[PDB]
Design a protein around this ligand. Sequence first.
Ligand SMILES: CCCCCCCCCCCCCCCCCC(=O)OC[C@H](COP(=O)(O)OCCN)OC(=O)CCCCCCCCCCCCCCCCC
Ligand SMILES: CCCCCCCCCCCCCCCCCC(=O)OC[C@H](COP(=O)(O)OCCN)OC(=O)CCCCCCCCCCCCCCCCC
Ligand SMILES: CCCCCCCCCCCC(=O)OC[C@H](COP(=O)(O)OCC[N+](C)(C)C)OC(=O)CCCCCCCCCCC
Ligand SMILES: CCCCCCCCCCCC(=O)OC[C@H](COP(=O)(O)OCC[N+](C)(C)C)OC(=O)CCCCCCCCCCC
Lengths: 78, 155, 183, 506, 75, 54, 105, 60, 192
Amino acid sequence: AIGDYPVYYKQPIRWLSYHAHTRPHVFYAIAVAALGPVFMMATPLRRKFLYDDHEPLPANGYPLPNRSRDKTLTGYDD
Amino acid sequence: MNLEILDLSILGFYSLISSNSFESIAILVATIMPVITELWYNYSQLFALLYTLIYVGAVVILFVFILSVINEKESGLFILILVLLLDDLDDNESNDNDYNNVYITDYADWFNNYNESDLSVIGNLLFTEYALLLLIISFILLMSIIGLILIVKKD
Amino acid sequence: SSTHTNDSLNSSNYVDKLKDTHFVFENDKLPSEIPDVEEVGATTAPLLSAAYFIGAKCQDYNDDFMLCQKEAKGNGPIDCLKEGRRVTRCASGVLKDLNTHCSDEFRLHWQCLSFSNLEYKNCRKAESLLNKCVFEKMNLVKKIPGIPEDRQIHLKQNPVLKPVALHQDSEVAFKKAQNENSI
Amino acid sequence: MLFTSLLLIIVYGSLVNKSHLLTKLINRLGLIIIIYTLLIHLNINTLENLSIGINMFNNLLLINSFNNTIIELILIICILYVLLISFNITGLSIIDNLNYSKRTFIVIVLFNIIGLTLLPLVNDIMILFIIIELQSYSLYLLTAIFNESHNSTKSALYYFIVGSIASFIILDATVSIYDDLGLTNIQYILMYIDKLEIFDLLCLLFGLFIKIGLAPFYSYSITIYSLSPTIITNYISLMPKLSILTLIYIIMHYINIVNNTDLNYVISFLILISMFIGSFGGLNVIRIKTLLAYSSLLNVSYMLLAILSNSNESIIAYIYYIIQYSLTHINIFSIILVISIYLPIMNNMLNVMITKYSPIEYINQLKNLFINNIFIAIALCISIFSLIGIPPLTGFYGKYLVLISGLNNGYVLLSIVLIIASSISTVYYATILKVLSFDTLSFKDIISNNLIINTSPENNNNEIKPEISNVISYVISSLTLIILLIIIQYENIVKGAYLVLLYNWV
Amino acid sequence: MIASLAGWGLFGVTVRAYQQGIRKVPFSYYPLGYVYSALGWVAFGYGFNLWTERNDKLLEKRVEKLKESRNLRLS
Amino acid sequence: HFRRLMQYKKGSARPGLAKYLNLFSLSKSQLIGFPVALGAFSFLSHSFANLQEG
Amino acid sequence: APLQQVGRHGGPNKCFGEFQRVVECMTNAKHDSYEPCNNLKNDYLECRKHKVERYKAFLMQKHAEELGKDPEEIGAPFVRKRRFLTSKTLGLVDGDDYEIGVEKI
Amino acid sequence: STADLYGLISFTPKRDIHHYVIRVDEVPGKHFPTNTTGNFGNTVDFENLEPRRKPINPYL
Amino acid sequence: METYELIDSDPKFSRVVRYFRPSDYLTWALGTIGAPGLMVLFEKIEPAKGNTFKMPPPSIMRIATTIGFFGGFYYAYTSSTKRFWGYSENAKEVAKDRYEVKKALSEKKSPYGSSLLNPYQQDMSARNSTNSQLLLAIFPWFNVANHQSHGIDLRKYYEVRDGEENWNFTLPPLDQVKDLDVAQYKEYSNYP
Ligand SMILES: CCCCCCCCCCCCCCCCCC(=O)OC[C@H](COP(=O)(O)OCCN)OC(=O)CCCCCCCCCCCCCCCCC
Ligand SMILES: CCCCCCCCCCCCCCCCCC(=O)OC[C@H](COP(=O)(O)OCCN)OC(=O)CCCCCCCCCCCCCCCCC
Ligand SMILES: CCCCCCCCCCCC(=O)OC[C@H](COP(=O)(O)OCC[N+](C)(C)C)OC(=O)CCCCCCCCCCC
Ligand SMILES: CCCCCCCCCCCC(=O)OC[C@H](COP(=O)(O)OCC[N+](C)(C)C)OC(=O)CCCCCCCCCCC
């Protein structure tokens, strides 16, 4: 097989080489696109080795203290 | 002088007299522009721009694209003005008189310290709450790509 | 967000013409049954400059004013009128203090905000002087809840995002404090 | 399972070489996918649990035991249709190779089954418009799948325009509902079922009435069905009514909460008018598909009386009728796809132009089928006798059950007209039986060797050579005996319909 | 219960017998055909009886509630 | 009728357009006969309803 | 249950509170019928269109017409052009009547 | 017996705007994408929420 | 009505696979080899072209195996799901589920797992994937998120049933269990 089109399930390595030579417009668009979801999967690796996720934003309105109203609150009265 | 009325009267005049397909495609553009402009002012600036980007930029120039493909071949002034005047008299789309004569306001409040555009909320709900609606749409788009090619492609 | 509404000023006078907007006044003052309060007169820039000192001084009343809104169950405006005056009086207390203790340090900072699109990132040199002054003369500090002390943004020695253009009064006042104070 | 396999078929079909054997083999892959879908559906979905009604996907889709009945029915009828395109309907390469000339045929059909099965489940006006378009777009593509044909493309153009106006009416009703209430979920609208303009739901029905071909909108459906290829007409004239009539029944279930009489009078005006046109229309017709188009309209008129009445007996009448009518429809069209082998060949007058899209097009092309194939002629006779309503076939119990639901709700006028309209329509069902058999004894001993079936090659001259393929023959026989012998297990089937609930409970 | 599957199987023999006429072949053609068509409907007949017995259990329980509701109506 | 007259003016030589417009056309008698009949129908139907007390 | 009536900032809007109180009543278990929730349904429709309140404004407009009450003295002062929200009108101490700047903020 | 059973099943209870089945099992608005606490008009509390009207399964 | 104990109204995807019975793997295997067989069975029933049996080309048999590979898994996934919902026999899974949860509460970890999703995102995710297996014959959708709306009462995992006390697991009060709604809103009433 000096120039035969490779069969993917028998020659996986040569099958990609055929497409990395004759179809550079397909092979590297797939290669670039897959590098996104691949990087998403390596997010847990970054958490344990680089830095934790930031604290979530306070985007839920005014932070209401979880308690009952103060009863001895005075001052600034009429 | 709500000049938006005069734009449609001209538009309503040429819709009654259009003969070829050049004028028919002109009625389309002459209708979106009042729709876009009356959305830019008043109601929603976001959907005025979405209409321009999606209707004019995408579906309108497709019409003129196929008109050049299809073909280009081939009343009385009293009746038209009489019809347009008759069309002009009664323009109340709804018959709740108080709803059309009495004005209302809203009260603003400062409880929303995380202020973000509408397109932020729409994406917030479309990609979380109604992710089924978003996913079916990409499915409807997918069928069109297959649907266009099976209809038109020769071999 | 510049969405049109029915509750405030819109983008252009062409919006007003389509909506037929009337800008309506109401001369009637509040009834005497509600004791009067002195409304805060500060504008946008001074409030954003003193916002974290109002938070440090009126924290109890702000929380109590909000807790009245939570537990009023929809009748918030009417059943929290007395608790809403403590907040107005407390905030007026802070702005009156800054005018009588740190008038130049305060004015320098909110002139910077009025000069740099009301953004805190552009006015750190003036803001650092104001915080240092307020601490010694009123004991108030600026704290951003939810993060460690070492990782607050306004204490960042080398910020990634810095102002494009410098405020002359800030840079001049800063280096003077590099002599007056950094002995 | 349907959606995931559709993507595999889309990609795979675009890879392999264009050929008939591969196209026919891919059609047999879809026949598996539809079968696999039914096994997974029946496994998880049960009548006993879906009785209460279960919200899915953020309440967008609501499923109960009434909808669940039709999904399984739709899957079943879609298996019997795919058997046509997946096997031989005649075995003569000239006639059959049309079914294998298109590779996207099975893909578009699989697109539609997703559209059909989700429509009864919709519970939001936002998803109602999306799903109705997914079904509507799939029909236009299937109508134009044979893009070389002039009549097929002309029909899809007519279909697209009428459906586009139909979809706009549907879209406008939902917008008007949103204008009044500001709510999109159907359950939230039910809280304001007394506070909204109930006629805006009727404007919604007027859009769904166009898509099922109900008079005065019946004109386009008759034209469309009489122009598409018989394989295409076999699908587009039955499937949309399966999923839309189920949706119409549910919308009418919610509507009858406020029991507005004006709404019922307008619908009775359309049901009454449709019976008239559905009966008197088919009296003067020559094309068989035009005849079955008028026949379809009349049966939809009967099925709306069960929908309009909308009681506990209306569920039984609709659930039974929609099942028996589908099997009858499949049985009749399957026979018409087969008996084209007995057509004569010229060796003249009236210059009748026949094409490979509708080889059987006129009623008198059924002539002497009692002679050429007696067994299949009786199967067509039994099927037509069911449509007439002769007991104890399946067709009688449909009309008998519909009449119970109609009269129990006081629809006396419509019940009498449907019994007049049934007898008027018997005239043109009897013509099909007249053509099948009545000239038997004059033609009994004739020298016939010019039939299309006589151009089939002789294989061995020693082995027996069956005239009709295996799978299509077994389907015709099975559905003919089920139609004929429903009396044996009728009691169990009807008692199996008492359990199908739509929020009856107690 | 075998007799119930006996009847269902005999219906399976009829369909294959009725298939021969449509194909126009001698009724003794391919005797293994009658076995396959018989067994196919016994499989259907087996499941069909399971479905109907399941309906009896469900309908008895539903009628228990319907009788109570009628008594409240008939008060 | 007047609206269908405007459609006649726009297209006359076209066979399909005049094919459909001619079906809906009402003769000058029908444009007068139909409104009279319904007006007569509604008057007689209501009048006989009062005479019969229902 | 799905979110309805979401404001332009992601939170509940003006009329969400009324709609939520309707859902609580309709889906409640201590109710025999839907009669008790009939008033809540009116409030949600009222919050959105103000039809009853606009009607009340119509009578007060019409009643003053039949009594001769001067509109300028019963109504509230208003300004139609935003450029003429001058400091004289706003009541500021030494305010001119010269127009205000509404060109660019 | 058959006449009795059919009389039970065929009967349809009357539905008016007062009694009908609504398939909503919970009150919306517990969590919003942002600014969950709006003008504080959400008077409904989810900590002390009364039990909802659960559906009846007539086969159970 | 065959009703059992409701283990989980919205079982998590990883849980549903880990709970496959050996028979479930058999169904997945049967579905995988059934689809290629069904193609062969049709050819035995009726040849695609000609009149004699001809084995379909190997390419069709590979795509047939893939289609039956998902279909077999989907049938396996739905059957395993009925047990969680209580529609099927779930006594074996109930003990297996209880062992994991009682162990989980003991370590003060959440039974449901920690989640990247905020409170609204957790509850929104539950709405999409709850009861989504009913349409798993039409299109796929799985619960792949560690949310908390599973339709159970965590109190029922405190009481000891037959054959459980021997596990000797200590369960703290739920108020001290990490990543639960009853253990998060301690500072502010709208932030966890
Ligand atoms: C910045 C201004 C841009 C527009 C410049 C032209 C203004 C002339 C008025 C036309 C526009 C009015 C809008 C209604 C469309 C009417 C189109 C029509 O009927 O034909 C107009 C044009 C001239 O032909 P005319 O003699 O008027 O009619 C009989 C000809 N057999 O027939 C022709 O097709 C000649 C070429 C005209 C092409 C114009 C394309 C359509 C207009 C799009 C641009 C403007 C968008 C609409 C804005 C106003 C909306 C009210
Ligand atoms: C206001 C606009 C004009 C009126 C439009 C009416 C719209 C509603 C009609 C519903 C049915 C749609 C019919 C299709 C459109 C018909 C339009 C039409 O009128 O065309 C004319 C056509 C015959 O045309 P022709 O008279 O030969 O040529 C005229 C020459 N100038 O005439 C026809 O063919 C019309 C007859 C078609 C069939 C209608 C019969 C319906 C059944 C009614 C009787 C029901 C009896 C039931 C018994 C119990 C109730 C009494
Ligand atoms: C060329 C030939 C011309 C015709 C000749 C006549 C052939 C007669 C065959 C006798 C068969 C027999 O005996 O059937 C007996 C069996 C089993 O009866 P069982 O166990 O008591 O079940 C209970 C029956 N009850 C109620 C009488 C007690 O029922 C059958 O299979 C019924 C036939 C199937 C009818 C279709 C309904 C099922 C499909 C549902 C989709 C709508
Ligand atoms: C557990 C019970 C399973 C029973 C088997 C089911 C699959 C059938 C395949 C058998 C093998 C085969 O196809 O054998 C081949 C035979 C004979 O074909 P022929 O017409 O003589 O062709 C000519 C043969 N030459 C080439 C030798 C000349 O086909 C049949 O007889 C098909 C019987 C119809 C299918 C019955 C299914 C009933 C469905 C009921 C549910 C609704």
